[PDB]
Amino acid sequence: VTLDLICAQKFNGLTVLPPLLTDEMIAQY
Amino acid sequence: GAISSVLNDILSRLDPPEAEVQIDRLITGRLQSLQTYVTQQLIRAAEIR
Amino acid sequence: GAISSVLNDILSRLDPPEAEVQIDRLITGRLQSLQTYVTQQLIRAAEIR
Amino acid sequence: VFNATRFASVYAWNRKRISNCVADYSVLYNSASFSTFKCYGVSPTKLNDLCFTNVYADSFVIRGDEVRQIAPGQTGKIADYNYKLPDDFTGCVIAWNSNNLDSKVGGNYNYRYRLFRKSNLKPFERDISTEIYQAGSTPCNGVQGFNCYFPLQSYGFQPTNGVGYQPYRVVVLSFELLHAPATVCGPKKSTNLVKNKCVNFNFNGLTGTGVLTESNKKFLPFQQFGRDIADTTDAVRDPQTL
Amino acid sequence: VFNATRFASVYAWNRKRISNCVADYSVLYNSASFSTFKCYGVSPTKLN
Amino acid sequence: SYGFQPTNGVGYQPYRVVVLSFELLHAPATVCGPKKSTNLV
Amino acid sequence: DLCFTNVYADSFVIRGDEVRQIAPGQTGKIADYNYKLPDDFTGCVIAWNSNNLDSKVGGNYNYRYRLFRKSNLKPFERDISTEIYQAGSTPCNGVQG
Amino acid sequence: QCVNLTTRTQLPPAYTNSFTRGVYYPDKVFRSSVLHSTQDLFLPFFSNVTWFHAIHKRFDNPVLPFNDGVYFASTEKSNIIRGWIFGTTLDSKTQSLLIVNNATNVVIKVCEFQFCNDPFLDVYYHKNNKSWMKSEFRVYSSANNCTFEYVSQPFLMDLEGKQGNFKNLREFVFKNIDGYFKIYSKHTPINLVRDLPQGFSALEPLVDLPIGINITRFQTLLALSSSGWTAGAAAYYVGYLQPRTFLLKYNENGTITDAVDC
């Protein structure tokens, strides 16, 4: 699964917020 | 809000520049009807799933 | 329905009196796009939850 | 176009073309010129702010009451026969009173128009057909008579005519917008280029705000403005120093 | 409408309706017995 | 009132004025020609 | 039926054909220079023909107007400056030329 | 000068498969690594394209209809077709466009032209020098009112060579729309006799002519005591564009490597 249009989205006001728990912390659980 | 609900009627009533004003009201309203329908079907679908 | 999708094109062409008529068409439609987006995201949220 | 001594007829109108020059639209409001100035597709005062690639002006003279019939969607013996604008027409229409000049004694036969036709003419087309208009079933045989009339008629022009019957010199302004580079623009002087900083840029008519840097994209010789998958502005070609 | 013996006065001016029929105005424009015939938003002969 | 007289000059004589006011393509036509008709399929 | 608090009435006289240019959003030597209505202006525009009175012989000079101005006048703002309008780069020195 | 020359054999009409061709770059906008859908006048894929000749016997240059654009592709050798003709009456009733390729340069001019019944370009063949030289230029009899003129950057072209089969392949697209006459061009070599190669390539822009002239028809100018000539072996194609929607594939370098016809 794969987590550029992204660059273009940020020009129109689209924002993506980061997750609180990282991928490593998920692996710890 | 349109003068009439029949499309060919308005096209056969108002002039080309005047008709588009009324035709847009039908397209706008009829468009909201689909949004209301699709909105309910998606919600009702959650109850069935 | 506006003369164009760029706000600068409306301001650079129509005056104070006439630009408001066209700008209103863009705002109303774009606002509906956000309503459609937020609505679908809330529906998808129920599936993820 | 505007200040020319004599225009052409509206039946067959001369279209003057203006490209690759400096267009000053502020002189119009600085020194009053146009008596009647109205813009259907654009604003009257915004011609100076926004500038266009190619300019097309149709110079012709018509009777006073015939001016309101030239416009998108309008009908009449003008729009429907000789000179017709398209329904989507985007442009301006100008008129002023030449009555003290064009009118000669009882009439002026240099300006003529099509008073009759058997159908609706298409926009931006000059019909030279002199065929006798036949209203009824009586054969005209190429001559005037009952329900038979000659389509091309001359404007009556007189110094004593009323405001509606007096001649008004009319010029229709057509233009091309953002379909090519801009060869017609006012005295807007180019400045130095700024890089590695956020700036408000106007490039070949493209206005916006953004950081200007050297792009790694390679445009083909004929390519100019690059765009991303979002159809927005990606990279542009400087028209002055390529 | 047009050929009536007498008409109404201008202050009381009547309005007559024309529907479900066939209209031929040709005799009006070609006839020289009429002083003024003019069509502002339409052509005189195109009415037929 | 009017000064209508048979002896009045041009412009002072009575002129019967009628105004034809119609509206084109603004609803189903109530006035048409007696020509076009086709068979039922 | 509905009544208002403050009522301001601006009285003046203009040329016959200049009455059409008085209205919100209009463009012309009137709205641009001497007298201008706001776009949001709420009110009533009135005119009537004084020709049987105001007209005197060849002209009436009691009613004047600003023909030329360097910018657009603000709505409902009276500018009495008589400074000579300079269309060129040559200084006018307060005299015609 | 004008000379009416008819001695030829008539051939029956013929057609060929267009395969995938007639695709051009709509705008100068740059795009890469994207699939863009465009709706405009194009040559439908797998259509029938007309097939014409210049032989020895057969000299084909009539007036052909021009509607919604026309596709030009020419299999030739030694540059047989040096120009084209465009307009409506072409009798000097109205203005018309004329495009001729001179050895050194191409000439684009708009005037009121009276065209010869059979325009051709004369050339001397093996007179005392064993070589060839261009002499007679015969296209129009007179030109009255001229407005637009353009001259291409100078170059050098060879009118000579004995090569047996066709070598150069030219593909052009001309359109008259809203008074704007646009030109799209590409050039590729070929090895074959009478047949159109099979392949897909996009046409690049070359000249944009806003002549505002009404063109309902076109005609071709072919290269050739004052009567009679030997026509060099040549063949050319005439297509007709249509409002078809294609999906264009822009690669990393910003070129069209594929197209899909909806």
Identify the biggest protein-protein contact and residues per side.
D-H, 21 and 17 residues
Helix content of chain A: 40-55%
| Structure summary, number of beta strands of chain A | 0
Biggest sheet record of chain A = none
Our estimate of the beta-strand percent of chain A is under 5%
Report the principal-axis shape of chain A. elongated
- The separation of the N and C termini of chain A measures 21 Å
Rg over C-alpha atoms of chain A, rounded to the nearest angstrom = 13 Å
Individual helix count of chain A: 2
Query: What structural class is derived from the secondary structure elements of chain A?
Result: mainly alpha
Oligomer description: part of a larger assembly
Question: What's the helix-strand series of chain A?
Answer: HH
What does this structure look like?
This is part of a larger assembly, with eight copies of chain A. With 29 residues, chain A is mainly α. Chain A contains two helices and no strands. Chains in contact: A-D, B-C, B-D, B-F, C-D, C-G, D-E, D-G, D-H, E-F. Chain D binds chain H through residues 15, 17, 19, 54, 56, 124, 180, 217-220, 222-229, 234-235, and chain H through 25, 28-34, 179, 204-205, 208, 210, 212, 253-255. The PDB classes it as viral protein. The entry lists the keywords SARS-CoV-2, coronavirus, Kappa variant, B.1.617.1 lineage, spike protein, viral protein. SARS-CoV-2 Kappa variant spike protein in transition state. Chains A and 7 copies are Spike glycoprotein.
